[PDB]
Design a protein around this ligand. Structure first.
Ligand SMILES: Nc1cc(Cn2c(C(=O)O)c(-c3ccc[nH]c3=O)c3cc(Cl)ccc32)ccn1
Length: 563
């Protein structure tokens, strides 16, 4: 069936759209080649529509059926709870898109009578009606990139009342079921330090390792109605409250498998028969589907002693080599099996014999040295997109601050320490905003974090070595330096000068600011300050941080204020 059908009505914006990076003094202190930075808009939506619209031909086999039964046997151990309306309301982001039915996210969070009444009516409708397709809005996503242009990605999501109901029925399922089913292969259970430990240990556990990343082209579009019902067959193995069983059944048939698409003007846009990017089950569903297809494909390809690491549509496989020619042929056999399963590749996969050459979750393993000279593996990535987005976020107030998430997740990197920490701490200190909570995303969930709490967060996630790494690899240094020349970012010597300046100001303030000066900027001086465990670090409640993926799932994970 066709992933989409279109009526001809346009994918429309709801307000004015900015595509060019503004010429602003603060963003220009970070990145001078402003014309290289752009944001996608609804203007390129028709280009994306062409790419995502295609017929799917899916052929299942015994390997697929065998893996599915094994996955279902593991899912059968799960007991999932139905969330109360209050619990589901507290998981709604404060700036989540308002309902078309006269209430918004603030009303949901405050448990307003109108919001609660409407949520109750939507819930009852899911219990009573098993068939009426649920309306969804389609919008072009606004995302920032560096040139060499990508067309806008499309986001498809149901009304706020429906999203609250999805949490009630499925938040516990999507949070617990993936690790029960996939075990150590489930990527979202790991902090970046745990992910690098898993990759390194997996790589070293093979006699002669071979690894590869597998990129599916337009994954959400490749997801069939059969795949979405298969995913539901796994959810149904949970012990569930009867109302949750009915809501999952109704949501699968009315929303997850497909439905009508409406633009921002209220016009009928078309019909979807593939994964919606903006529902609670997107991450969990994509992860399970990718794992199922890939596990079965490994068996079809006769790949030996396979270990997979899956995060949504992102897949990395580490296995035992059978020799270069044999591995090349087995990888073609894997690709052929994935294609039959309706998961064809974007770029054909390449066998890799060096762990640092694999790019998975847009990241690669690299090595640096701690204060004692001991080798420390850590995850890095090309800094082009993080820097382009940090420049955008400096010039415009954006709902999500990717710079903050990048500092948290890539804290040990040369680029996050020398550039992002230096730039943002300098600006925030000049604005007396170091203590102001900002929103960022970790594994798709929204968190409200104060920049002053970064030292303890980083220590918990990455260890104290995140503040002591040095002797970065020549390859990593060259990649960063080349990216700075390309984007017109001042060189690392300028960043060291700026860091010494902000470090002195932070130390002079005492309190939490001085902890930031001591730990975050110890790299900038020869006269190192002693770094001991931060007391606040052991007291941090990081429950929920690295449990599951929630991209597109409208999840907020910071504490709710009592009423
Ligand atoms: N490209 C992907 C990435 C993922 C998993 N993943 C995410 C993620 O965005 O989910 C982040 C991440 C980076 C910055 C801010 N916040 C974050 O969560 C991240 C960082 C490392 Cl080191 C490893 C994996 C990571 C899943 C699917 N496709």
């Amino acid at each position: 069936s066709m992933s989409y059908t279109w009526t001809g009505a346009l994918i429309t914006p709801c307000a004015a759209e900015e595509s060019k990076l503004p010429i602003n003094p603060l963003s220009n202190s970070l990145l001078r080649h402003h014309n290289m930075v752009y944001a996608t808009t609804s203007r390129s939506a028709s280009l994306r529509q062409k790419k995502v619209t295609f017929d799917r031909l899916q052929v299942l086999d015994d390997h697929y059926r065998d893996v599915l039964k094994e996955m279902k046997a593991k899912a059968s151990t799960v007991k999932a709870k139905l969330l109360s309306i209050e619990e589901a309301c507290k998981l709604t982001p404060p700036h989540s898109a308002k309902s078309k039915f006269g209430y918004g996210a603030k009303d949901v969070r405050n448990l307003s009578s109108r919001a609660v009444n409407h949520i109750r009516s939507v819930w009852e409708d899911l219990l009573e009606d098993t068939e009426t397709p649920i309306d969804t809005t389609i919008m072009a996503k606004s995302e920032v990139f560096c040139v060499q242009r990508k067309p806008a990605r499309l986001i498809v999501f149901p009304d706020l009342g429906v999203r609250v109901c999805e949490k009630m029925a499925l938040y516990d399922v999507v949070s617990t079921l993936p690790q029960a089913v996939m075990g150590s292969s489930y990527g979202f259970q790991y902090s970046p330090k745990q992910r690098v430990e898993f990759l390194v240990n997996t790589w070293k556990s093979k006699k002669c390792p071979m690894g590869f990343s597998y990129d599916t082209r337009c994954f959400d579009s490749t997801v069939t109605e059969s795949d979405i019902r298969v995913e539901e067959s796994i959810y149904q193995c949970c012990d569930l409250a009867p109302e949750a069983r009915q809501a999952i059944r109704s949501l699968t048939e009315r929303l997850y498998i497909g439905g009508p698409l409406t633009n921002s003007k209220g016009q009928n846009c078309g019909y979807r028969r593939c994964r919606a990017s903006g529902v609670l089950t997107t991450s969990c569903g994509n992860t399970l589907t990718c794992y199922l297809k890939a596990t079965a494909a490994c068996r079809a390809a006769k790949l030996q002693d396979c270990t997979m690491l899956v995060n949504g549509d992102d897949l990395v496989v580490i296995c035992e080599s059978a020799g270069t020619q044999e591995d090349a042929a087995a990888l073609r056999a894997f690709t052929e099996a994935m294609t039959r399963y309706s998961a064809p590749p974007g770029d054909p996969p390449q066998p890799e014999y060096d762990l640092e050459l694999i790019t998975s979750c847009s990241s690669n393993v690299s090595v640096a040295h701690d204060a004692s000279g001991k080798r420390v593996y850590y995850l890095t990535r090309d800094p082009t997109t993080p820097l382009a987005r940090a420049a955008w976020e400096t010039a415009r107030h954006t709902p999500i601050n990717s710079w903050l998430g990048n500092i948290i997740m890539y804290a040990p990197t040369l680029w996050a320490r020398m550039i992002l920490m230096t730039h943002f701490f300098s600006i925030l200190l000049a604005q007396e905003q170091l203590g102001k909570a900002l929103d960022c995303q970790i594994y798709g969930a929204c968190y409200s974090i104060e920049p002053l709490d970064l030292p303890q967060i980083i220590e918990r996630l990455h260890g104290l070595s995140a503040f002591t790494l040095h002797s970065y690899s020549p390859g990593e240094i060259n990649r960063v330096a080349s990216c700075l020349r390309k984007l017109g970012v001042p060189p690392l010597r300028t960043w060291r000068h700026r860091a010494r300046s902000v470090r002195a100001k932070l130390l002079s303030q005492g309190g939490r600011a001085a902890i930031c000066g001591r730990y975050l900027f110890n790299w900038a001086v020869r006269t190192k300050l002693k770094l001991t465990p931060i007391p606040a670090a052991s007291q941090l409640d990081l429950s929920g941080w690295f449990v599951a993926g929630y991209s597109g799932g409208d999840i907020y994970h910071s504490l709710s204020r009592a009423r």
